[PDB]
Amino acid sequence: VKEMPGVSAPLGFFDPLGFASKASPETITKYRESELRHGRTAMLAVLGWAFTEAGCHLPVFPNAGTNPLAAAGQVPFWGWAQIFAFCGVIEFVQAKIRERPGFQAGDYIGSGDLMDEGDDQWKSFQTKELNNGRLAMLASIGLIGQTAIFGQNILEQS
Amino acid sequence: SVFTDATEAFSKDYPDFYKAGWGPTTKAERWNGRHAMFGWVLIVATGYAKAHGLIPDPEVALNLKEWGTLSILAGPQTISNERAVVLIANVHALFMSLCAAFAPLSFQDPLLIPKGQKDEPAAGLIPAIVPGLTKEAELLNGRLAMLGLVLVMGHSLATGTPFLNSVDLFLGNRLG
Amino acid sequence: TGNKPFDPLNIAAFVPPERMRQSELHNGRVAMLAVVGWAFPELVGKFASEDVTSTHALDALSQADPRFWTQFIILCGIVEANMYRHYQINNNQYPFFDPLNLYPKDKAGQQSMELKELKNGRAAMIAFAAMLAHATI
Amino acid sequence: ANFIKPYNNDPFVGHLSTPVTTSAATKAFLGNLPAYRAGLSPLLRGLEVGMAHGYLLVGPFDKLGPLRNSEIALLSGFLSAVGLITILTLCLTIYGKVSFQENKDLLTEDGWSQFTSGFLVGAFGGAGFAYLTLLNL
Amino acid sequence: ASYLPSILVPLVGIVFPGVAMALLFLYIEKDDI
Amino acid sequence: GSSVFDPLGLATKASDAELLRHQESEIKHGRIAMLAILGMAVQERFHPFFPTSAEVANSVDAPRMILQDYGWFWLLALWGVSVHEYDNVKHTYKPESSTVKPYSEILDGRVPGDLGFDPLELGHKEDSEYYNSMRLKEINNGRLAMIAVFGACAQEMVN
Ligand code: CLA
Ligand code: CLA
Ligand code: CLA
Ligand SMILES: CC1=C(/C=C/C(C)=C/C=C/C(C)=C/C=C/C=C(C)/C=C/C=C(C)/C=C/C2=C(C)CCCC2(C)C)C(C)(C)CCC1
Ligand SMILES: CC1=C(/C=C/C(C)=C/C=C/C(C)=C/C=C/C=C(C)/C=C/C=C(C)/C=C/C2=C(C)CCCC2(C)C)C(C)(C)CCC1
Numbered sequence: 070v071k072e073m074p075g076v077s078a079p080l081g082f083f084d085p086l087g088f089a090s091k092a093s094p095e096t097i098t099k100y101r102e103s104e105l106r107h108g109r110t111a112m113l114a115v116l117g118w119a120f121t122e123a124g125c126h127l128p129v130f131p132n133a134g135t136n137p138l139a140a141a142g143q144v145p146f147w148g149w150a151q152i153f154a155f156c157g158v159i160e161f162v163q164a165k166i167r168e169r170p171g172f173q174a175g176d177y178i179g180s181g182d183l184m185d186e187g188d189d190q191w192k193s194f195q196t197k198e199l200n201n202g203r204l205a206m207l208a209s210i211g212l213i214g215q216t217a218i219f220g221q222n223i224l225e226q227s
Numbered sequence: 228s229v230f231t232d233a234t235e236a237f238s239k240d241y242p243d244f245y246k247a248g249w250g251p252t253t254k255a256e257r258w259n260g261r262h263a264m265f266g267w268v269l270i271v272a273t274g275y276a277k278a279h280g281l282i283p284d285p286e287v288a289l290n291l292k293e294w295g296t297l298s299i300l301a302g303p304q305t306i307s308n309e310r311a312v313v314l315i316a317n318v319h320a321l322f323m324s325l326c327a328a329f330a331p332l333s334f335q336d337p338l339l340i341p342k343g344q345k346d347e348p349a350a351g352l353i354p355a356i357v358p359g360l361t362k363e364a365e366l367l368n369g370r371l372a373m374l375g376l377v378l379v380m381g382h383s384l385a386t387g388t389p390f391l392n393s394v395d396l397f398l399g400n401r402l403g
Numbered sequence: 404t405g406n407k408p409f410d411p412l413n414i415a416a417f418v419p420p421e422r423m424r425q426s427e428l429h430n431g432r433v434a435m436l437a438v439v440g441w442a443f444p445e446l447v448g449k450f451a452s453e454d455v456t457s458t459h460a461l462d463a464l465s466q467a468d469p470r471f472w473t474q475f476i477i478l479c480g481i482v483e484a485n486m487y488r489h490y491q492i493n494n495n496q497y498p499f500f501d502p503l504n505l506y507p508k509d510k511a512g513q514q515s516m517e518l519k520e521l522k523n524g525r526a527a528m529i530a531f532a533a534m535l536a537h538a539t540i
Numbered sequence: 541a542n543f544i545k546p547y548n549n550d551p552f553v554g555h556l557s558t559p560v561t562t563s564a565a566t567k568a569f570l571g572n573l574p575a576y577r578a579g580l581s582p583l584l585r586g587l588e589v590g591m592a593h594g595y596l597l598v599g600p601f602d603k604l605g606p607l608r609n610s611e612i613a614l615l616s617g618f619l620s621a622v623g624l625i626t627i628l629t630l631c632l633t634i635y636g637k638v639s640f641q642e643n644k645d646l647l648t649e650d651g652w653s654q655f656t657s658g659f660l661v662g663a664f665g666g667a668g669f670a671y672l673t674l675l676n677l
Numbered sequence: 678a679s680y681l682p683s684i685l686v687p688l689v690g691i692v693f694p695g696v697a698m699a700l701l702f703l704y705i706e707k708d709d710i
Numbered sequence: 711g712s713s714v715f716d717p718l719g720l721a722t723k724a725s726d727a728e729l730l731r732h733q734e735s736e737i738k739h740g741r742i743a744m745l746a747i748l749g750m751a752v753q754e755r756f757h758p759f760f761p762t763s764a765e766v767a768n769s770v771d772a773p774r775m776i777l778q779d780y781g782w783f784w785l786l787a788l789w790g791v792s793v794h795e796y797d798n799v800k801h802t803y804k805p806e807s808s809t810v811k812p813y814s815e816i817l818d819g820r821v822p823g824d825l826g827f828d829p830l831e832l833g834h835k836e837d838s839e840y841y842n843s844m845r846l847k848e849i850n851n852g853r854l855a856m857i858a859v860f861g862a863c864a865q866e867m868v869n
């Protein structure tokens with residue numbers, strides 16, 4: 070839908086390939102959910118990539134502090150298992166959210182039942198989140214790509 | 228009767244505890260009798276284990292470092308390993324006891340009288356004689372076991388011999 | 404409830420029958436799996452170090468890695484939680500376990516199959532008791 | 541916008557509908573906890589709470605107790621957790637017998653009694669499971 | 678003798694106060710008699 | 711079935727319960743099988759995704775070597791498949807209501823194989839004839855792929 074947040078941009082509504090042109094409300098809601106999940110995950114991924122690149126490593130990961138893709142190996146299988154468990158717990162919470170009648174895509178704060186009235190500033194700030202998230206998605210995929218192709222790694226003239 | 232008068236005096240003195248079943252009540256009698264029956268079983272088993280040395284024997288005393296200052300008796304002395312072993316054999320049953328006391332099986336008899344209910348009628352000097360797994364048999368055997376514990380303990384204390392050795396003296400001297 | 408009253412002795416005076424039939428079934432199914440547990444290893448063989456090499460004896464209890472006991476308890480707890488979700492919360496009124504569905508539509512078929520399961524399970528109980536008699540009297 | 545509005549649309553009650561107090565996240569998270577979940581017998585609520593709080597409690601005693609440096613640290617921690625659980629169940633029983641005196645919602649004599657029995661069983665289960673897990677790790 | 682303190686001190690310092698406080702708590706807020 | 715012909719056997723023709731669930735199972739098997747065969751082909755001619763796999767005689771023995779080396783990948787794949795199926799259960803099949811055994815009845819008015827995955831609207835639902843013909847094409851290519859998967863496990867069999 071054109072009214073939902075994220076639209077404000079130089080491009081305006083950006084749907085070259087028809088995906089929301091005839092999509093039922095369920096499919097558009099799922100598309101927005103995916104966009105927000107990817108965007109937030111990418112924002113965190115870029116921030117973590119910056120943290121690792123700058124040498125900022127936890128005391129428990131002393132040896133590996135140079136290349137994030139290299140650092141990924143240092144994590145034992147059970148560390149990744151616990152990452153997955155935590156993400157699954159949050160996903161279970163969000164699934165419990167979506168059962169509530171008045172759910173809007175990505176509004177895990179229940180803004181509809183919280184705001185005194187729907188506002189334009191709220192839409193603009195949701196758009197800010199979506200835009201920084203889209204940029205973070207592109208930037209994170211680009212970071213991984215540029216570091217895989219050229220092994221020198223960011224901050225090393227990459 | 229004298230027993231009835233004593234029970235009435237207890238009821239008047241401490242109505243709350245008597246109501247809940249605490250004190251001289253048939254529920255308490257049954258519980259103590261069951262415990263005493265198991266206790267006779269456990270004393271027989273302890274004697275047999277002492278005879279066959281299954282218990283680590285008093286030659287060995289628990290190390291202070293591993294078992295902490297709880298093992299300390301007085302100062303340097305430490306609880307013997309046999310006393311610890313018997314205590315643990317008892318701790319198993321005590322853990323069971325708490326579990327079954329606060330979370331009784333629905334068909335199980337509660338430890339305390341239910342709020343609505345009242346204690347069952349008194350058995351009397353000679354409880355009604357009926358064989359098999361019937362309440363009267365259980366109560367009679369519990370009374371017998373508790374009396375036996377009392378009088379064997381009296382024997383051991385008066386003569387000065389250990390309780391286990393007094394039990395050995397009885398039977399046919401099978402145990403030790 | 405669905406076996407018919409030809410019981411050898413009286414124990415049901417002070418115990419509800421619904422829970423007791425459920426316990427009959429639980430213990431019977433576990434006993435069938437346990438009889439297989441004490442037959443199949445001996446007949447077909449144990450298949451790894453087992454943390455200590457032994458078979459045909461109860462001692463495996465101590466030899467088996469506690470990891471296995473933990474995971475087995477977890478599995479049993481989760482399956483029992485689902486089975487409790489049935490028959491006591493949602494009262495689904497259809498059998499909890501029926502992939503490749505059996506258990507005929509007619510009520511009489513239900514009763515007959517329940518009787519068959521009870522018989523096969525009681526026999527397994529007796530067999531497991533005899534096995535433990537073989538082992539440790 | 542305005543994310544802070546009076547709770548229940550009642551300006552004169554001592555509460556506010558802040559994002560922490562009244563948001564889909566918190567309502568759904570608290571509404572699925574055993575203490576507030578719908579369609580749970582009080583026994584099940586107690587069992588869930590006890591399982592959560594028993595496994596949770598072995599660790600501090602095990603790792604920071606006086607016997608933490610001995611080879612029997614885990615057993616001492618488990619025993620301390622068991623004792624504390626027993627104390628808490630005593631507390632629960634007395635609270636139930638004092639509060640609700642003149643199966644249902646958890647706020648009743650029988651409801652609270654079932655909750656406490658479930659809590660004891662679940663807490664001992666959690667402590668035992670934590671012991672089993674830590675015994676080999 | 679030399680065994681009693683181990684038995685009694687825990688009872689007097691833990692079990693006795695625990696049961697005493699439980700009973701006092703029950704009686705203080707009994708709301709009847 | 712294919713064209714306007716009838717089934718090739720006894721063909722569960724006496725299924726009082728509607729065949730919708732069996733048709734859903736058929737289309738699911740077929741989609742899995744066609745993905746499997748196309749994958750297998752690409753793997754046999756191209757294998758860059760998981761290096762250090764040593765020698766792979768054919769696609770059949772690749773899973774064993776991956777388990778040996780990349781054990782976590784199969785856990786991740788199983789997670790993905792399971793979560794996807796659970797998510798599908800929402801818009802396919804009828805929920806439990808003290809009856810309606812779970813995963814037993816396709817919801818009324820829902821053509822089998824419809825998970826809503828129509829991003830490019832290549833198959834026009836409005837045009838009934840075109841949509842039905844495309845469904846038939848999918849089903850038949852999928853049956854062919856299902857046969858082909860075993861015809862390929864023959865590659866494992868010969869050696
Ligand atoms: C008021 C007098 C008094 C005081 C202050 C103490 C103090 C003590 N006694 Mg001793 N004791 C006393 C009288 C007293 N005793 C008498 C008369 C006897 C003969 C039965 C004993 C026999 C005795 C033994 C056999 C042992 C102690 C031990 C102890 C110590 C631990 C407490 C304990 O376990 O009690 C246990 C005491 C009893 C079971 C009997 C009760 C003691 C008196 C009679 C109670 C007086 C109550 C008082 C009037 C106030 C009541 C109000 C109160 C409820 C608030 C402690 C230093 C233990 C020890 O040495 O540890 C190192 C130990 O093993 N006591
Ligand atoms: C005055 C009586 C008294 C006695 C006899 C004890 C005895 C003990 N305390 Mg101390 N304590 C007391 C009062 C007392 N406490 C008071 C008033 C405080 C508050 C200031 C404390 C604060 C305190 C701390 C902070 C700690 C102790 C600890 C300990 C234990 C020492 C460690 C050890 O070797 O055991 C090893 C312990 C075990 C093997 C666990 C067994 C635990 C119990 C005995 C199991 C049975 C409990 C039973 C079911 C409860 C009945 C409930 C109800 C009926 C009363 C020991 C059992 C330490 C401890 O427990 O370590 C974790 C510890 O860290 N105590
Ligand atoms: C039933 C289907 C199926 C199964 C079980 C497998 C299983 C396997 N494949 Mg094959 N594959 C498949 C379909 C399948 N594939 C299809 C349809 C393609 C597209 C041509 C590929 C392309 C492919 C390549 C190029 C390679 C593998 C490899 C492998 C192995 C390692 C996993 C991997 O990297 O795969 C990669 C799988 C994909 C990228 C799947 C894309 C298509 C799926 C079916 C759609 C949905 C997946 C999900 C949303 C993620 C999409 C990721 C995105 C990049 C497209 C593993 C044995 C690797 C190997 O070691 O071979 C020996 C390897 O190098 N596969
Ligand atoms: C549960 C159980 C069981 C069982 C148990 C029981 C049942 C027991 C019983 C027990 C008992 C039951 C005991 C008893 C005892 C008794 C005694 C020991 C007695 C004594 C007596 C006397 C001492 C006497 C005296 C006298 C005379 C001489 C004459 C008369 C008078 C007078 C009194 C003086 C079993 C085995 C299965 C095992 C497990 C546990
Ligand atoms: C994530 C995180 C968080 C939180 C966390 C938490 C809070 C956790 C918890 C945890 C827990 C809390 C856990 C628990 C667990 C438990 C368990 C696991 C249990 C188990 C149990 C069992 C197993 C039982 C058993 C039994 C019984 C019941 C009885 C007896 C018998 C038996 C043994 C069978 C936050 C966000 C804040 C932050 C970050 C991190």
Ligand SMILES: CC1=C(/C=C/C(C)=C/C=C/C(C)=C/C=C/C=C(C)/C=C/C=C(C)/C=C/C2=C(C)CCCC2(C)C)C(C)(C)CCC1
Binds near residue numbers: 740746772773
């Ligand atoms: C109905 C019917 C019929 C027919 C039947 C048939 C013939 C069936 C078949 C069926 C089939 C025959 C199916 C198949 C399926 C398949 C599938 C479902 C597949 C899967 C696959 C996968 C899962 C994959 C795997 C893999 C991996 C893992 C890695 C790489 C390699 C590969 C790719 C292999 C008739 C006409 C007689 C009539 C009567 C009834």
